[PDB]
Design an enzyme around this catalytic site. Structure first.
Site, PDB file in Angstrom:
ATOM      1  N   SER A 199       0.593  -4.704  -3.437  1.00 33.16           N
ATOM      2  CA  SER A 199       0.360  -3.401  -2.822  1.00 33.16           C
ATOM      3  C   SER A 199       1.336  -2.394  -3.415  1.00 33.16           C
ATOM      4  O   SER A 199       1.435  -2.274  -4.631  1.00 33.16           O
ATOM      5  CB  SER A 199       0.548  -3.466  -1.302  1.00 33.16           C
ATOM      6  OG  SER A 199      -0.412  -4.322  -0.720  1.00 33.16           O
ATOM      7  N   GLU A 331      -9.287  -5.571   1.929  1.00 33.53           N
ATOM      8  CA  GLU A 331      -8.334  -4.509   2.230  1.00 33.53           C
ATOM      9  C   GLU A 331      -7.602  -4.924   3.498  1.00 33.53           C
ATOM     10  O   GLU A 331      -6.499  -4.455   3.774  1.00 33.53           O
ATOM     11  CB  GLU A 331      -9.049  -3.188   2.493  1.00 33.53           C
ATOM     12  CG  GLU A 331      -9.983  -2.731   1.402  1.00 33.53           C
ATOM     13  CD  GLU A 331     -10.573  -1.372   1.711  1.00 33.53           C
ATOM     14  OE1 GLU A 331     -11.152  -1.214   2.806  1.00 33.53           O
ATOM     15  OE2 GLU A 331     -10.458  -0.461   0.864  1.00 33.53           O
ATOM     16  N   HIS A 412      -4.690  -8.446  -0.114  1.00 28.69           N
ATOM     17  CA  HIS A 412      -3.567  -7.864   0.611  1.00 28.69           C
ATOM     18  C   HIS A 412      -2.855  -8.830   1.552  1.00 28.69           C
ATOM     19  O   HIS A 412      -3.272  -9.018   2.695  1.00 28.69           O
ATOM     20  CB  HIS A 412      -4.023  -6.643   1.416  1.00 28.69           C
ATOM     21  CG  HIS A 412      -3.818  -5.343   0.710  1.00 28.69           C
ATOM     22  ND1 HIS A 412      -4.519  -4.990  -0.424  1.00 28.69           N
ATOM     23  CD2 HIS A 412      -2.973  -4.316   0.963  1.00 28.69           C
ATOM     24  CE1 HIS A 412      -4.112  -3.804  -0.838  1.00 28.69           C
ATOM     25  NE2 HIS A 412      -3.175  -3.373  -0.013  1.00 28.69           N
TER      26      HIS A 412
END
Ligand SMILES: *[C@@H]1O[C@H](CO)[C@@H](O[C@H]2O[C@H](CO)[C@@H](O[C@@H]3O[C@H](CO)[C@@H](O)[C@H](O[C@@H]4O[C@H](CO)[C@@H](O)[C@H](O[C@H]5O[C@H](CO)[C@@H](O)[C@H](O)[C@@H]5O)[C@@H]4O)[C@@H]3O)[C@H](O)[C@H]2NC(C)=O)[C@H](O)[C@H]1NC(C)=O
Ligand SMILES: *[C@@H]1O[C@H](CO)[C@@H](O[C@H]2O[C@H](CO)[C@@H](O)[C@H](O)[C@H]2NC(C)=O)[C@H](O)[C@H]1NC(C)=O
Ligand code: 4PN
EC number: 3.1.1.1
Length: 501
Positions: A199, A331, A412
């Site tokens: 990220s 996500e 993620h």
């Protein structure tokens, strides 16, 4: 009890034994790599740490950088790769790193060093929520988790010399310098440092790879779900932003210097106060999607970045070295009118002109599956836009420059459970993912020591040449090709049509 020497003074760590391993791991928590960024040092580059004469107890987790403690406590609980959930403390005095070394401190260790840069939108996060106690033990490497100024403290910029910006990034550079001048004492090899993160950490590694000031600070890099091309974490300028922040604090905006000076007078609590009011980490639906640039970010400062990332990448004259870029299709239901709207509202986060907005939708969320449940395609395009597409673009750029490149799609934060070996010192999950972890750390480490992820007992991982060879990791790990090639095509073209409207 391990006592190691450092340029600035001695530190006292502790031994931790990981069941399944003969050799303990020496751990040092909260080692300073700079001087506390207080007072006049706020909004300034990191200064070296003053030396100390006593032996410094480094067996306690250092505080994390000022941030939204609610969003900070939550992200910490959802990313810890351990079972215990550490008792966080936040402070502007947060420039510390944690060291995990399996080397025998009695000898001359020359183990490869892996420095982890946490993610969290450059607004939240900490190094302690991550545990290298497993990666270091399992792969025989030295693991270093670094911290860097966040939010206003880390990225407040007036677009000129009075507050260039990128303090957070300058803190990462300083930790890398610290590792150079000290890691040898911990059995680490400064000649083999690998930077990696996901990220916002992922893009930080990317940014650092492209910066003129990181020459010789590391030798390989791994960006996970984040690269220098994320439109959300970079903006050529943020003067207007700096002004909104100065006003929200009750500071005049007569000049850049007056602004910075007034803000330096504020209290951590007062600035924490502004941070919450600004409501950074959150999408604002109502209003115009172009006035909500409420996102502190990386900028062009003429120091860390002489020019924008897209261009530096184009010039192909940055730090050429092994770079592994990877993503996770996630996500972590609605119709085509409301979804297409969310896209427009997500403008700041993805910059997609309203004009285009419907097109993308009718393409991804297109007239294929009219159901609502099957609008998880929205979340797919939204990901390709955030990191999927950019990653490949970054990779292609690196490859096209003649640098060892590599890609991968994990199936993620989840890869993190595997990257830092959560499956060992945690709850204890599927014996299946536990091996998945070991396989991951294996690639990361082999890449760490060779710049090639390949090794015995691990499926072939093709270089990222022009066949777009990339690894596919999950329950079943295999090799593939052309990652996000179709998606990249549709966008590079879509944004092409409006290249000369
Ligand atoms: C919000 O949404 C808009 C529209 O979708 C985004 O679009 C862009 O806005 C700029 C329009 O002028 C673009 O940048 C310009 O146009 C191209 C970009 O493709 C560049 O060629 C231009 O000049 C560059 O100068 C340097 C000098 O060293 C050259 O090296 C460059 O050559 C390569 O670099 C470009 C970098 O973009 C690459 O595309 C190619 O490899 C070039 O060959 C080049 O000659 C000039 O930069 C941008 O594409 C894009 N953003 C900007 C402002 O640059 C807009 O970006 C977006 N904003 C946000 C919030 O991200
Ligand atoms: C080093 O720091 C530790 C931790 O701050 C000091 O001891 C404390 O931590 C221990 C766990 O590691 C606890 O078991 C102890 O209860 C706690 N001390 C107290 C108040 O009992 C330690 O004194 C410091 N000194 C050194 C060099 O070890
Ligand atoms: C056109 C193609 C991609 N962009 C942009 C589009 C949206 N903003 C970030 C990338 C730059 C120029």
């Amino acid at each position: 009890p391990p006592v190691v020497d450092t340029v600035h003074g001695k530190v006292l760590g502790k031994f931790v034994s990981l069941e399944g391993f003969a050799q303990p791991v020496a751990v040092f928590l909260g080692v300073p790599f700079a001087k506390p960024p207080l007072g006049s040092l706020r909004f300034a580059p990191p200064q070296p740490a003053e030396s100390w004469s006593h032996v410094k107890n480094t067996t306690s987790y250092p505080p994390m950088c000022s941030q939204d403690a609610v969003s900070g406590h939550m992200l910490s609980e959802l990313f810890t790769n351990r079972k215990e959930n550490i008792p966080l403390k936040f402070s502007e005095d947060c420039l510390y790193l944690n060291i995990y070394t399996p080397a025998d401190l009695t000898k001359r260790g020359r183990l490869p060093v892996m420095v982890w840069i946490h993610g969290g939108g450059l607004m939240v996060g900490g190094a302690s929520t991550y545990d290298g106690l497993a990666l270091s033990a399992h792969e025989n490497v030295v693991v270093v988790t670094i911290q860097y100024r966040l939010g206003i403290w880390g990225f407040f910029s007036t677009g000129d010399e009075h507050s260039r910006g990128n303090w957070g990034h300058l803190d990462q550079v300083a930790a890398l310098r610290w590792v150079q001048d000290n890691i040898a004492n911990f059995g680490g090899d400064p000649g083999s440092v690998t930077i990696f993160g996901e990220s916002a950490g992922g893009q930080s590694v990317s940014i650092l790879l492209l910066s003129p000031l990181t020459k010789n600070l590391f030798h390989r890099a791994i960006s996970e779900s984040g690269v220098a091309l994320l439109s959300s974490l970079f903006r050529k300028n943020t003067k207007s932003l700096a002004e909104k922040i100065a006003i929200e604090a009750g500071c005049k905006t007569t000049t850049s210097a007056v602004m910075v000076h007034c803000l330096r007078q504020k209290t951590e609590e007062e600035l924490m106060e502004v941070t919450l009011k600004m409501k950074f980490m959150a999408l604002d639906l109502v209003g115009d999607p172009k006035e909500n640039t409420a996102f502190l970010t990386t900028v062009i400062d003429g120091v860390l970045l002489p020019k924008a990332p897209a261009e530096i990448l184009a010039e192909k004259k940055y730090n050429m070295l092994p770079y592994m870029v990877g993503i996770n299709q996630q996500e972590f239901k609605l119709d085509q009118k409301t979804a297409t709207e969310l896209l427009w509202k997500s403008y700041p986060i993805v910059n997609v002109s309203k004009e285009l907005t419907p097109v993308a939708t009718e393409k991804y969320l297109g007239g294929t599956d009219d159901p609502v449940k099957k609008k998880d395609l929205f979340l797919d395009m939204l990901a390709d836009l955030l990191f999927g597409v950019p990653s490949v673009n970054v990779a292609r750029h690196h490859r096209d420059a003649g640098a060892p490149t590599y890609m991968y799609e994990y199936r993620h934060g989840d890869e993190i459970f595997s990257v830092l070996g959560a499956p060992f010192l945690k709850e204890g999950a599927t014996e299946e993912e536990i091996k998945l972890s070991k396989m991951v750390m294996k690639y990361w480490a082999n890449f760490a020591r060779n710049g090639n992820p390949n090794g015995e007992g691990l499926p072939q991982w093709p270089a990222y040449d022009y066949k777009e060879g990339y690894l596919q990791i999950g329950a079943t790990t295999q090799a593939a090709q052309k990652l996000k090639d179709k998606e990249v095509a549709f966008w590079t073209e879509l944004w092409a049509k409006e290249a000369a409207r």
